[PDB]
Amino acid sequence: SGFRKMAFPSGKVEGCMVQVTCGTTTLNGLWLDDVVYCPRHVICTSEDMLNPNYEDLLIRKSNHNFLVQAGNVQLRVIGHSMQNCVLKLKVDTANPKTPKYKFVRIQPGQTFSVLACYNGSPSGVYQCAMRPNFTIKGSFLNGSCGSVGFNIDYDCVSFCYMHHMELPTGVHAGTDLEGNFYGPFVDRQTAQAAGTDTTITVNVLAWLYAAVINGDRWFLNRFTTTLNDFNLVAMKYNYEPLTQDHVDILGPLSAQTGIAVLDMCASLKELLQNGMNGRTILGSALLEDEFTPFDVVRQCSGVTF
Amino acid sequence: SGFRKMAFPSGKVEGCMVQVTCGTTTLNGLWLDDVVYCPRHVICTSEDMLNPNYEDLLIRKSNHNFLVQAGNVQLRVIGHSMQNCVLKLKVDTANPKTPKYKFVRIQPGQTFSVLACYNGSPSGVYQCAMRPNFTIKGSFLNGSCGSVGFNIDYDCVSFCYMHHMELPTGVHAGTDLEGNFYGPFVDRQTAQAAGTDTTITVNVLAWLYAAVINGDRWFLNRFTTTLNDFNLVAMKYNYEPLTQDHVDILGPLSAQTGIAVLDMCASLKELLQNGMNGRTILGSALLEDEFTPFDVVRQCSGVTF
Ligand SMILES: *C(=O)[C@H](C[C@@H]1CCNC1=O)NC(=O)[C@@H]1[C@H]2CCC[C@H]2CN1C(=O)CCc1cc(F)cc(F)c1
Ligand SMILES: *C(=O)[C@H](C[C@@H]1CCNC1=O)NC(=O)[C@@H]1[C@H]2CCC[C@H]2CN1C(=O)CCc1cc(F)cc(F)c1
Contact A11 B15 (CB under 8 A): yes
Phi, psi (degrees; rounded to nearest 5) at A181: -60, 150
Q: Which residues, other chains included, contact B96 with Cβ-Cβ below 8 Å and sequence gap of 6+?
A: none
C-alpha span between B299 and B292 (Å, rounded)? 11
Q: Residue A188's Cα: distance from chain center in Å?
A: 21
* Angle, helices B261-274/B201-213, rounded to nearest 10 degrees: 100
The nearest alpha carbon in chain B to A214 belongs to: B170
Q: Which residues, other chains included, contact A12 with Cβ-Cβ below 8 Å and sequence gap of 6+?
A: A99, A152, A157
Q: Solved by what technique?
A: X-ray
Distances (CA, A) of B151 to A23, B6, B125, B249: 35, 12, 12, 19
**Given the residues B38, B41, B117, B164, the one annotated as active site:** B41
Contact A6 B125 (CB under 8 A): yes
C-alpha span between A288 and A266 (Å, rounded)? 17
Q: Which residues, other chains included, contact A176 with Cβ-Cβ below 8 Å and sequence gap of 6+?
A: A103, A104, A105, A106, A160, A161, A162, A182
Contact criterion met (CB below 8 Å) for B287 and B204? yes
Closest-CA distance, B60 to chain A, in angstroms, reads 31
Closest-CA distance, A233 to chain B, in angstroms, reads 20
C-alpha span between A162 and A113 (Å, rounded)? 11
* CB contacts, 8 Å: A215 with chain B: 170
* Angle, helices B201-213/B293-301, rounded to nearest 10 degrees: 20
Provide CATH code, domain B201-301: 1.10.1840.10
* CB contacts, 8 Å: A2 with chain B: 137-140, 166, 170-172
* CB contacts, 8 Å: A10 with chain B: 9-11, 125
C-alpha span between B102 and B100 (Å, rounded)? 7
DSSP string, A147-215: -EEEEEETTEEEEEEEEEEE-TTS-EEEE-TTSPBSTT--SSSS--------B-HHHHHHHHHHHHHTT
Phi, psi (degrees; rounded to nearest 5) at B145: -55, 140
Distances (CA, A) of A291 to A128, A208, A238, B111, B134: 9, 10, 18, 23, 28
Dihedral (C-alpha) B286, B128, B25, B170: value to the nearest 10 degrees? -20
Q: Which of B3, B6, B297 to mutate to test the interface with A (most CBs of A within 10 A)?
A: B6
Q: DSSP assignment, residue A242? A: P
User: Is the minimum CB–CB distance between A251 and chain B shorter than 8 Å?
Assistant: no
Q: DSSP assignment, residue A48? A: G
Phi, psi (degrees; rounded to nearest 5) at A108: -60, 140
C-alpha span between B5 and B128 (Å, rounded)? 9
Closest to B176 (Cα-Cα) out of B30, B46, B282, B6: B30
B246 among known catalytic residues:
no
Contact B121 A280 (CB under 8 A): no
Closest to B182 (Cα-Cα) out of B243, B129, B238, B250: B129
Beta strand A111-118 pairing with A148-153: antiparallel
Reading phi first (left if > 0) and then psi (alpha if -120 to 50, else beta), residue A106 is in beta
Vertex B265 angle, CA B262 and B269, to 5°: 145
Q: Which of A137, A170, A304 sits opposite B122 (nearest CB)?
A: A304
User: Is the minimum CB–CB distance between B232 and chain A shorter than 8 Å?
Assistant: no
A18 SS3 class = strand
A74 SS3 class = strand
Ligand 1 centroid, distance to B4 Cα (angstroms): 18
C-alpha span between A28 and B10 (Å, rounded)? 19
What is the 3 state secondary structure string of chain B?
CCCCCCECCCHHHHCCEEEEEECCEEEEEEEECCEEEEEHHHHCCCCHHHCCCHHHHHHCCCHHHCEEEECCEEECEEEEEEECCEEEEEECCCCCCCCEEEECCCCCCCEEEEEEEECCEEEEEEEEECCCCCCECCCCCCCCCCCEEEEEECCEEEEEEEEEEECCCCCEEEECCCCCECCCCCCCCCCCCCCCCCECHHHHHHHHHHHHHCCCCCCCCCCCCCHHHHHHHHHHCCECCCCHHHHHHCHHHHHHHCCCHHHHHHHHHHHHHHCCCCCCECCECCCCCCCCHHHHHHHHHCCCC
Q: Which of B4, B123, B215 sits opposite A302 (nearest CB)?
A: B123
Q: How many CB pairs under 8 A join A and B?
A: 153
How many residues in chain B?
Answer: 305
C-alpha span between B249 and B292 (Å, rounded)? 10
Q: How many other C-beta atoms lie within 10 A of the C-beta of residue B16?
A: 24
Q: How many other C-beta atoms lie within 10 A of the C-beta of residue B253?
A: 22
Which residues does a 6 A CB cutoff place in the pocket of ligand 1? A 27, 41, 49, 140-145, 164-168, 172, 187-189, 191; B 1
User: Is the minimum CB–CB distance between A99 and chain B shorter than 8 Å?
Assistant: no
Stretch (H or E) spanning A31:
strand A25-32
Ligand 1 centroid, distance to A237 Cα (angstroms): 30
For ligand 2, whether the C-beta of B73 sits within 6 Å is: no
* CATH homologous superfamily, domain A11-91: Trypsin-like serine proteases (2.40.10.10)
Ligand 2 centroid, distance to B41 Cα (angstroms): 10
Q: DSSP assignment, residue A240? A: P
Ligand 1 centroid, distance to A166 Cα (angstroms): 5
Residue of B47, B166, B175 to mutate, ligand 2, most atoms within 8 A of C-beta: B166
| Rg, C-alpha atoms of chain A | 22
Contact criterion met (CB below 8 Å) for B37 and B101? no
Contact criterion met (CB below 8 Å) for B111 and B127? yes
B64 among known catalytic residues:
no
Beta strand A156-166 pairing with B17-22: unpaired
Ligand 1 centroid, distance to A189 Cα (angstroms): 7
Contact criterion met (CB below 8 Å) for B244 and B251? no
Contact criterion met (CB below 8 Å) for B109 and B207? no
C-alpha span between B284 and A2 (Å, rounded)? 19
Phi, psi (degrees; rounded to nearest 5) at A27: -145, -175
For ligand 2, whether the C-beta of B61 sits within 6 Å is: no
Give strand pairing partners of B28. Answer: B19
Closest to A31 (Cα-Cα) out of A13, A55, A46: A13
Q: How many other C-beta atoms lie within 10 A of the C-beta of residue B134?
A: 17
C-alpha span between A296 and A127 (Å, rounded)? 13
Q: How many other C-beta atoms lie within 10 A of the C-beta of residue A39?
A: 26
C-alpha span between B140 and B156 (Å, rounded)? 26
Task: Please report which ligand is nearest the Cα atom of A190.
Answer: 1
How many residues in chain A?
Answer: 305
Q: Which residues, other chains included, contact B232 with Cβ-Cβ below 8 Å and sequence gap of 6+?
A: none
DSSP string, A107-147: PTT-EEEEEEEETTEEEEEEEEE--TTS-B-----TT-TT-
Reading phi first (left if > 0) and then psi (alpha if -120 to 50, else beta), residue B149 is in beta
Q: DSSP assignment, residue A63? A: G
* CB contacts, 8 Å: A170 with chain B: 1-2, 214-215
Q: How many other C-beta atoms lie within 10 A of the C-beta of residue B97?
A: 14
Ligand 1 centroid, distance to B130 Cα (angstroms): 36
User: Is the minimum CB–CB distance between A286 and chain B shorter than 8 Å?
Assistant: yes
A244 SS3 class = helix
